[PDB]
Design a protein around this ligand. Structure first.
Ligand SMILES: Nc1nc2c(ncn2[C@@H]2O[C@H](COP(=O)(O)OP(=O)(O)OP(=O)(O)O)[C@@H](O)[C@H]2O)c(=O)[nH]1
Ligand SMILES: CN[C@@H]1CCc2c(ccc(O)c2O)[C@H]1O
Lengths: 337, 282, 300, 54
């Protein structure tokens, strides 16, 4: 028992030896000569009303015109941001919903919550009656995120320190991932849907492999919980938003933390992160009722979006990089451009 | 230089009363978190106060300074009608607010069902219609005319202003305008105080061995309204019940004392922290 | 297409009309959250409330519980007289009754998922739900419940001489006090009242009546305690009345330290098996709302 | 005891991996951003004539 503990310490210390031997120079020194972007200011274009309570979930569509939002009153409304007209409104069996998705083909919408069950709804159906397709129920703990690989595959992560990959046709788990020591709260598939990451409450993130089903790497540069995670458009980096008012950028190939974004006056938590079309801006929500805009290569704040009367709980950017949608706890969405 | 020095006093009252209601009117409509079921009554009261401070006080001040009317008979009648309409439409909102508080505190569960936006709009329209019924209709129909030499002389003169009216119309207008809301407000606030006292006793029973605020608030709210309006609405009946008891300087002074209540109101009401935040931001 | 918008404009109108109907219903309901330590009575209270207001697999469930209870007592105590020292080893409460309406209430079942109950009293909508996890050291789901009317807290007051399950060296009642302190001093729950149910009053009278296992051994402060002057000993021996108020007083010490007028604790002495506690929740729920309005308008 | 054996085996898997210097990764990120900066409607504002939301 205790004999293997000595081996574990040597292996853990071996990792830091190689990582510390590859840090040629910091990122900031490399990008010192780059001219700053400037000052970025945007104004609200549309405001979407009609929810009866706070909002947790949000996701765009591939056409970058329609979006779906979830709330605690039990509704799953689908909007149309161009003309501001609700297209659907699905009642829910449970009033506790913490996530939603939207299929790449647009014919399905997902949901989940404290009831430990994921549900799939059908939109493009005969006679125009939306009904539950499946109920992926074999799981424990409340879910935190759902993502669609294609029309048949879905990935879920929950508070029982596990992540699983499902199969809608049979409603059974193809594979399961284990190794976290705390609740899992976020994931983000790679652009090619071959790898994905996950940030847990043990102040760590891991890089799983969908085909193999085993962990590959572990990044441990934080000091508190992790509430959000996003993936660089290149496919070789990702940014993490923790509960210690800081966001960090990690690199897969170099296997080290690259750069840290923090401010002295900021003492509130972070709920969501997202990148831009070209991966130059790092928008991040906050608990102090407004959203800040960062700089990818300089850590220079370049604007504040403060049009909300409560905390920001979700954030998203369209596929073509035309607008930023932010939901909040006051039941109001906003589209910035 | 009596007119010059006192002229600033009238201007200071007129300027403040107009500017005080701008903050309340703009903040409630423009912002979203400040719109509630009970704020519509406050907005209606602020609108009435704005109308009075814009249309009643300046003409009276100009008449006082110039010692003569200028516009003529029709505009004089119109001005008096606006005076009565706006005085009656400001007192009757306070009774509605008091009844709203009484319903909210005494019956909590049924408060959600009892009051809605449609009901609030209906009651506001009804009270405004009642207020406008007392002023325009009995004035434009010349129903308040007095039967003596002074009244007919003033009606014949096209360059003077006064106010002579019957006993019956005076007492009916007073009853409809001021006396009826007073008893309702008194009863409502007595009941609210009793409920607050019982609630305070219950906590002491539960947390013993571990009523200044309510008394102060109710005392302020009732004392301001009584001290501002009752002195006018006693002489308004006294001077028509018996003749030559009360002169006209006292009449005008008490009328203006009643007028300044509209300026005082937005300090008493709309003191919520959200209102203060809106005022600081705006 | 000119006609394309007309259909879409009609689509919004039908949907936006339904939301108004749901607005009135949602704003006219009260949500109550049940909390407490394990093996306290959270499911027993929610069972009888549904039966009192709203109103074959149980045969197998009773058999499964009966078999488990017999094996544990016979085997563990080997390391009538066995039940005398039943506190040393873990044992269920339904062992004596089942081995020898009310019977259906004595059954116990583990909690997975979420369990909600809908009931109405005097044409008032109530929605009480219990949230069950095997154990969560950290509750990150407690931020969602930020708009509930009240929190119902259930604590077993006849469980001072027992030890928790996960850790075999932690006092059971002292663990209940630790949980209450964390819940009360929570950043999100800054304006939520608490209703306290000092449950299992029936067993508390039994333990004190028997001489063995005096409460002074486990809580040394009981020796210097005396009955409060404002005591309404109900009906009960003076010894039992002193015991009840010592446990109640400890919970009130934590709550009364903070809150700044936005928090209140209502203690009750219940027995979830039989005591008619439907009106107790109703009376205190009308006081919570009434005090909330009184706090507004600066009347309080 | 058994759990600790799995942890040691897992860590040794990550011990032997190929790594590159930070300079190459920073250069790649900067080059990607510079190349794709042109078609970024959030950075460089688009004309109001070609704005779907305006
Ligand atoms: N003697 C006695 N036993 C009671 C009383 N109330 C409940 N019990 C018993 O205690 C058992 C344990 O409580 P349970 O309700 O089973 O536990 P639970 O509340 O479901 O457990 P949690 O999931 O932790 O809430 C009950 O099933 C009853 O057998 C009471 O007033 N007196
Ligand atoms: C000249 N000013 C008028 C005179 C009489 C009067 C007023 C207000 C309310 C009434 O019911 C009245 O009868 C005053 O505003």
């Amino acid at each position: 028992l205790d004999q293997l503990r000595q081996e574990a310490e040597q292996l853990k210390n071996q990792i830091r030896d190689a990582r510390k031997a590859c840090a040629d120079a910091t990122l900031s020194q490399i990008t010192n000569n780059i001219d700053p972007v400037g000052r970025i200011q945007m104004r609200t274009r549309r405001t979407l009303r009609g929810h009866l309570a706070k909002i947790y979930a949000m996701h765009w569509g591939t056409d970058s015109r329609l979006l779906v939002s979830a709330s605690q009153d039990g509704k799953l409304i689908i909007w149309d941001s161009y003309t501001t007209n609700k297209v659907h409104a699905i009642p829910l069996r449970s009033s506790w919903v913490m996530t939603c998705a939207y299929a790449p083909s647009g014919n399905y919408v997902a949901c989940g919550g404290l009831d430990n069950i994921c549900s799939i709804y059908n939109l493009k159906t005969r006679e125009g009656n939306v009904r539950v397709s499946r109920e992926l129920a074999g799981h424990t703990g409340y879910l935190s995120c759902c993502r669609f690989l294609d029309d048949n595959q879905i990935v879920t992560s929950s508070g029982d320190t596990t992540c699983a990959l499902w199969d809608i046709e049979t409603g059974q788990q193809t594979t399961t991932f284990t190794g976290h020591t705390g609740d899992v709260m976020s994931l983000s598939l790679a652009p090619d849907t071959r790898l994905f990451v996950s940030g847990a409450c043990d102040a760590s993130a891991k890089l799983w492999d969908v085909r193999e089903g085993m962990c590959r790497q572990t990044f441990t540069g934080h000091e508190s919980d992790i509430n959000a995670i996003c993936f660089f458009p290149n496919g070789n980096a990702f940014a993490t938003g923790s509960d210690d008012a800081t966001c960090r950028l990690f690199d897969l190939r170099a296997d080290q933390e690259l750069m840290t974004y923090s401010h002295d006056n900021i003492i509130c938590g972070i709920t969501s992160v997202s990148f831009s079309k070209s991966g130059r801006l790092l928008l991040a929500g906050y608990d102090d009722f407004n959203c800040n805009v960062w700089d990818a290569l300089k850590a220079d704040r370049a604007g504040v979006l403060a049009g909300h009367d409560n905390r920001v709980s979700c954030l998203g950017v369209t596929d073509d990089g035309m607008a930023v949608a932010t939901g909040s706890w006051d039941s109001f969405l906003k589209i910035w451009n | 230089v009596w007119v010059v020095g006192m002229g600033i006093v009238m201007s200071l009252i007129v300027l403040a009363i107009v500017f005080g209601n701008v903050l309340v009117i703009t903040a409630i409509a423009k912002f979203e978190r400040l719109q509630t079921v009970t704020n519509y009554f406050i907005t209606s009261l602020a609108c009435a106060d704005l109308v009075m401070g814009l249309a009643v006080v300046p003409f009276g001040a100009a008449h006082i300074l110039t010692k003569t009317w200028t516009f003529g008979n029709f505009w004089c009648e119109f001005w008096t009608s606006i005076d009565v309409l706006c005085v009656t439409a400001s007192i009757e909102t306070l009774c509605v607010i008091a009844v709203d508080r009484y319903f909210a505190i005494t019956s909590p569960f049924k408060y959600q069902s009892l009051l809605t936006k449609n009901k609030a709009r209906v009651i506001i329209l009804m009270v405004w219609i009642v207020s406008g019924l007392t002023s325009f209709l009995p004035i434009q129909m010349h129903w308040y005319r007095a039967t003596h030499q002074e009244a007919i002389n003033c009606y014949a003169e096209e360059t003077c202003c006064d106010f002579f009216t019957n006993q019956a119309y005076a007492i009916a207008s007073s009853i409809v305008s001021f006396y009826v809301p007073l008893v309702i407000m008194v009863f409502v606030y007595s009941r609210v105080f009793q409920e607050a006292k019982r609630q305070l006793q219950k906590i002491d029973k539960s947390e013993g061995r571990f009523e200044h605020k309510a008394l102060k608030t109710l005392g302020i709210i009732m004392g301001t309204f009584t001290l501002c309006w009752l002195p006018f609405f006693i002489v308004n009946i006294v001077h028509v019940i018996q003749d030559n008891l009360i002169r006209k300087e006292v009449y005008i002074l008490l009328n203006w004392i009643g007028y300044v209540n509209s300026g005082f109101n937005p300090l008493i009401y709309c003191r919520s922290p959200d209102f203060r935040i809106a005022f600081q931001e705006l | 297409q000119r006609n394309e918008e007309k259909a879409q404009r009609e689509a919004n109108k039908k949907i936006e009309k339904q939301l108004q109907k749901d607005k009135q219903v949602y704003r006219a309901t009260h949500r109550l959250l049940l909390l407490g330590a394990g093996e306290s009575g959270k499911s027993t209270i929610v069972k009888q409330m549904r039966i009192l207001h709203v109103n074959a697999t149980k045969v197998q469930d009773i058999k499964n519980n009966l078999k488990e209870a017999i094996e544990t007592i016979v085997a563990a105590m080997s390391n009538r007289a066995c039940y005398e020292r039943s506190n040393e080893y873990q044992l269920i409460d339904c062992a004596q009754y089942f081995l020898d309406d009310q019977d259906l209430l004595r059954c116990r079942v583990l909690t997975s998922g979420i369990f909600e109950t809908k009931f109405q009293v005097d044409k008032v909508n109530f929605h009480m739900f219990d949230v069950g996890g095997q154990r969560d050291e950290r509750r990150k789901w407690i931020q969602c419940f930020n708009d509930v009317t009240a929190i119902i807290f259930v604590v077993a007051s006849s469980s001072y001489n027992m030890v928790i399950r996960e850790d075999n060296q932690t006092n059971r009642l002292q663990e209940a006090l630790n949980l209450f302190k964390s819940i009360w001093n929570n950043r999100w729950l800054r304006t939520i009242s608490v209703i306290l149910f000092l449950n299992k009053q029936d067993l508390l009278a039994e333990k004190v009546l028997a001489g063995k296992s005096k409460i002074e051994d486990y809580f040394p402060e009981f020796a210097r305690y005396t009955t409060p002057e404002d005591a309404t000993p109900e009906p009960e021996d003076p010894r039992v009345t002193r015991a009840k108020y010592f446990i109640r007083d400890e919970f009130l010490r934590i709550s009364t330290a903070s809150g700044d007028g936005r928090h209140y604790c209502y203690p009750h002495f219940t027995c979830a098996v039989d005591t008619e506690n439907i009106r107790r929740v109703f009376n205190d729920c009308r006081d919570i709302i009434q005090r909330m309005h009184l706090r507004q308008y600066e009347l309080l | 005891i058994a759990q600790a054996r799995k942890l040691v085996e897992q860590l040794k898997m990550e011990a032997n991996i190929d790594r590159i210097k930070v300079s190459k990764a920073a250069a790649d990120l900067m080059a990607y951003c510079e190349a794709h900066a042109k078609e970024d409607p959030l950075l460089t504002p688009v004309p109001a004539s070609e704005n779907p939301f305006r």
